[PDB]
Amino acid sequence: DHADAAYVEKHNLQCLFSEMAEQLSEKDPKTEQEAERILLEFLTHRKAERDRAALRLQFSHSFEVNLDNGRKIMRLQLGQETSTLQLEQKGRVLKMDEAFSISLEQTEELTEMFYELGRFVVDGTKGEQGGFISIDERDVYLLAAGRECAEAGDELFNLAMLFSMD
Ligand SMILES: [K+]
């Protein structure tokens, strides 16, 4: 009933649950069936955005994510049996560096959190920007600013940090 409202805070899923409730306020459905349809369309459209980010941000060697422009950075290089991973953070609340290796399963999990950040890529330069992504030391894409882009970055760094603890 309310061990639920706990599992959701306890796993950083409060943001997702909140964007869902948010999506129901904007459309204001007449029934529970209308609401659930809207949540099924919401998730489907995001899977589409994510499917397109994966096509555009496809990488063979390396990626870099650089956010809050400068003050959070992750670089990943692929290898046959493991990926290598370098992080930096210089915020007011946390300063850190990390360098270490992750499994092929870990790379797959991280890659999905990365494509999720990829949904915030802009084609403009007219627009507030939150940073960029480099692919294979060739292409560079700018990221949009704002709380949903920041949340996606938070979730991506937090997972890499978790992998640092074995
Ligand atoms: K790169």
Side-chain angles (χ1 to χ4, degrees), residues 20 58-59 68 72 81 112 134 139 146:
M20 288 194 291
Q58 207 172 348
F59 69 95
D68 303 346
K72 243 188 297 179
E81 273 178 342
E112 282 308 319
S134 131
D139 290 311

Short mmCIF file of all heavy atoms in Angstrom, two decimals, residues 20 58-59 68 72 81 112 134 139 146:
data_model
loop_
_atom_site.label_atom_id
_atom_site.label_comp_id
_atom_site.label_asym_id
_atom_site.label_seq_id
_atom_site.Cartn_x
_atom_site.Cartn_y
_atom_site.Cartn_z
N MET A 20 5.35 10.83 -14.96
CA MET A 20 4.08 10.16 -15.34
C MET A 20 2.90 10.96 -14.77
O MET A 20 2.01 11.41 -15.57
CB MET A 20 4.05 8.69 -14.90
CG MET A 20 4.98 7.88 -15.75
SD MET A 20 4.71 6.14 -15.56
CE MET A 20 5.26 5.78 -13.90
N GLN A 58 25.30 5.76 -32.09
CA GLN A 58 26.01 4.47 -32.35
C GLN A 58 27.52 4.73 -32.28
O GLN A 58 27.98 5.63 -33.06
CB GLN A 58 25.57 4.10 -33.77
CG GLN A 58 25.56 2.64 -34.12
CD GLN A 58 24.93 2.42 -35.49
OE1 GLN A 58 24.31 3.31 -36.11
NE2 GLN A 58 25.10 1.20 -35.99
N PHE A 59 28.26 3.99 -31.44
CA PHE A 59 29.73 4.12 -31.28
C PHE A 59 30.47 2.77 -31.36
O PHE A 59 29.99 1.74 -30.79
CB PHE A 59 30.02 4.89 -29.99
CG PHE A 59 29.70 4.19 -28.69
CD1 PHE A 59 30.69 3.49 -28.00
CD2 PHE A 59 28.43 4.23 -28.16
CE1 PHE A 59 30.38 2.81 -26.83
CE2 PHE A 59 28.14 3.61 -26.95
CZ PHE A 59 29.11 2.86 -26.32
N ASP A 68 26.96 20.19 -17.31
CA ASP A 68 26.86 21.37 -16.39
C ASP A 68 27.95 22.22 -16.95
O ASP A 68 28.70 22.80 -16.18
CB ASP A 68 27.08 21.14 -14.90
CG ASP A 68 26.17 20.11 -14.24
OD1 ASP A 68 25.14 19.72 -14.89
OD2 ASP A 68 26.49 19.69 -13.05
N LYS A 72 31.09 17.88 -14.88
CA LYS A 72 30.86 16.41 -14.83
C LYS A 72 31.27 15.80 -16.16
O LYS A 72 30.73 16.23 -17.18
CB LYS A 72 29.40 16.05 -14.57
CG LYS A 72 29.17 15.32 -13.27
CD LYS A 72 27.78 14.78 -13.06
CE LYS A 72 26.73 15.86 -12.99
NZ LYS A 72 25.42 15.20 -12.83
N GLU A 81 37.30 -7.78 -24.14
CA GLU A 81 36.79 -8.51 -22.94
C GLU A 81 36.22 -7.55 -21.88
O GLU A 81 35.35 -8.01 -21.11
CB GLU A 81 37.89 -9.44 -22.40
CG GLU A 81 37.92 -10.81 -23.05
CD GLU A 81 39.02 -11.73 -22.55
OE1 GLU A 81 40.00 -11.22 -21.94
OE2 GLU A 81 38.93 -12.95 -22.78
N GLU A 112 22.72 1.85 -22.18
CA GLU A 112 21.27 2.18 -22.27
C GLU A 112 21.00 3.51 -21.55
O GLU A 112 20.04 4.23 -21.98
CB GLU A 112 20.36 1.05 -21.72
CG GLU A 112 20.15 -0.14 -22.66
CD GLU A 112 19.69 0.25 -24.07
OE1 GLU A 112 18.82 1.18 -24.18
OE2 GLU A 112 20.20 -0.35 -25.07
N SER A 134 30.66 13.36 -27.32
CA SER A 134 31.53 13.02 -28.47
C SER A 134 31.40 11.50 -28.70
O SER A 134 31.39 10.81 -27.72
CB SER A 134 33.00 13.53 -28.29
OG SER A 134 33.96 12.50 -28.55
N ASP A 139 32.63 12.86 -33.97
CA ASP A 139 31.38 13.65 -33.98
C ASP A 139 31.12 14.15 -32.57
O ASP A 139 31.40 13.40 -31.62
CB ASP A 139 30.23 12.82 -34.55
CG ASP A 139 30.46 12.63 -36.02
OD1 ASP A 139 30.73 13.65 -36.66
OD2 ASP A 139 30.39 11.47 -36.49
N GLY A 146 18.16 22.06 -18.58
CA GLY A 146 16.85 21.82 -17.93
C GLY A 146 16.83 20.54 -17.10
O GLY A 146 17.75 19.70 -17.28
#
